[model samples]
Target chain A: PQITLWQRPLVTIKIGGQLKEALLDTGADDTVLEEMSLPGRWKPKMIGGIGGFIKVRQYDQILIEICGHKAIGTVLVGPTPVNIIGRNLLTQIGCTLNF
Target chain B: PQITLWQRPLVTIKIGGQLKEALLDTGADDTVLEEMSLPGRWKPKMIGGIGGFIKVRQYDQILIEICGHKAIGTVLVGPTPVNIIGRNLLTQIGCTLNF
Candidate 1:
């Protein structure tokens, strides 16, 4: 798939049997989802963003279906304005930036 | 140029005769730069990101040289963790996501 950056790069993603829309954030180092419950233990974690730092729950080895591609990686659940699919999971799907 | 998501997609950009590195953030709707002095009048504005929203000064039609490609668009100045080249400018350079 090829996506032009004229608009917000939002795409549908499936996580824990729930479908949600997420931004394909090349600027973010790690994937972060809105606060939700997932099956597994999570560790208290901290992450920094454009605004400031925030505390989040880090759940490792989580499965996420991003635009039909399946990936397993660390997912940080926290208070975010929106869901973000970052480099960690994007790499798994062989996503790349082209110009 | 093609960039893989294995590492942070940081690129050097030229703005106002100064060169700085910035992240190519598809998730962001507007391009944001760190606090700086630009020759023009700007309006006070607010923008939301991963964690929360912050106050910024909006400068319209600013020229930016991103990775040797020139683009002019709205540039928000504020206290952000990093400089971000969002979709507004990315589209000018014909940037896209390919998988």
Candidate 2:
């Protein structure tokens, strides 16, 4: 699938058997999602960004279905304004930047 | 041109007569660059990202050459970890997300 930059590069994803929309964030090094409930043990962690850093719960070995492709990796839950699918998961699904 | 997620989608861009590397960030709504000197009257502004928001100098009508494509738009200068060509500029070069 190819998504134009004229609009946001947002895609549908399935996590915990729930459907959600997330942006394909090439600038972000790790995937960060809005706070949500997940049945797993997590650890406290912090991630930095343009402005500053924030604490988040790190959930490892999470299964996510992205654009019909399934991938398992670590997911960070925090107070992000939007859900972002960063490089960590983008690489697993063979995502790319094209012109 | 297509860039794989296996590596950062960084490309050389010309700004203020200097060449610099920047990332194609689909998750960002506005373009952000590391602090640099540009001849223009700018306004103080704030932008938000993964963790929080940061203050920046907004330079409008700034000319930038991205991957050989020229575009004029508002560019924000701040203490960003990396230069980011957000959707604001990526659209000008017809960049897209592909899988």
Candidate 3:
């Protein structure tokens, strides 16, 4: 028997005035933060989705430092199973996923 | 007097055997097809979001040949402002924007 590892770099995001650990998933198309774990006063507009249309509320503008590089953008407020680093932010930094 | 036009290349997608026009948005991280304009038998997994977790249902598995190049992937069924050509599919083609 052998053990396998599914390890990719994780990006740290500031949520609710604290730093939370999140995996960098380029497969995801938007910067999705966990719902119940977000800060206040950040309500994002409802962007349409595949199922119909859903509300995407904004949370906060914070320092999102990835690969030791930092950029400031508005984070979505709410609960997600995993935090997604979408192309909107990735293209800004000139990086892409190797997977 | 002066005039400025914001023109970018458009891609045609086949929904219900009818070719519809779509604008390519690299800023978007996912290939989001229109909700009411999809074909049939394609559904997507509901990944969590910022407000909370919402269901991401599947819509169709139709042919999405981009720029005469073809790749098979699930198209999300729903309504969106514009179809997003995210990094998930764009990175596969090995091209980056000059903007």
Candidate 4:
């Protein structure tokens, strides 16, 4: 199914068994979510941004649901305004630009 | 007719007879491009971002061609890394988040 990209392209997502809303960010290379709980431990690393760097716990083999489409991939939980579904999950969902 | 959203969601856009690559950013409010010459009038303003704000020259009624679709809207020119086609131009071209 196709989804309309709104002024703010936000979508409902399910991650780590919890339902959440994520922004569709194509500019981001990896999926970044606000601090969340994970089953196992992860090594935290820093990724640079506009102001400074954000420390993130990168977890692999995590289930991410985008618009009812589910896929297992890597997810980074860090300090972010909102959870973003980046290219990693977008590929599985077959998301494309429509005109 | 539909366009598959690529992993990066970058597209070729035409601005002032020059073709350039622009990222499809749903998160951005107004379309932003690198500093360029405009045919008409504009206003200078600042938009807040992560670290701080950047000065921008906002031009109205500028012609933008995205994926073969032509639209005339406001385009902000600033010190941006890449040209970004934000929601303002996206809506005019029937762009949406597809899955």
Measured against the true structure, the TM-scores of the candidates, in listed sequence, are 0.91, 0.90, 0.44, 0.89
> Where is model 2 more than 4 Å wrong at Cα?
B50-52
What CAPRI-style quality would you assign to candidate 1? medium
lDDT of candidate 4 over A1-99, digit per residue (tens): 755655578778888578778888766678888867878878788876544577899998887777668888888988786677777777777776677
What's the C-alpha lDDT at position A65 in model 2?
Answer: 96
Predictions in order: lDDT = 0.88, 0.86, 0.50, 0.79
Candidate 1, B1-99: lDDT as tens digits:
999989999999999899888998898888899988889899999898655689999999899997779888899998888899889899889999988
From the highest lDDT down, the ranking of the candidates is: 1, 2, 4, 3
Pick the winner on DockQ between candidates 2 and 3. 2
Clashing pairs in 1: none
Candidate order by DockQ, decreasing, is: 1, 2, 4, 3
Question: Each predicted complex: what DockQ?
Answer: 0.74, 0.72, 0.07, 0.61
Return the TM-score for candidate 3, rounded to 2 decimals: 0.44
Query: Candidate 1 vs candidate 2: which has greater DockQ?
Result: 1
I-RMSD for candidate 1: 1.7
Q: Write the per-residue lDDT of candidate 1 for residues A30-96, one digit (tens) a residue.
A: 8888957788689999887666688999989988887668998998998887789999999999999
User: Which candidate comes out best when scored by lDDT?
Assistant: 1
For model 4, how does the per-residue alpha-carbon lDDT over B1-99 read when each residue is reduced to its tens digit? 455544577789899999989988776778889887778778998976556677999999888887778999999988876688888888778877777
Compute the lDDT of residue A41 as modeled in candidate 4: 75
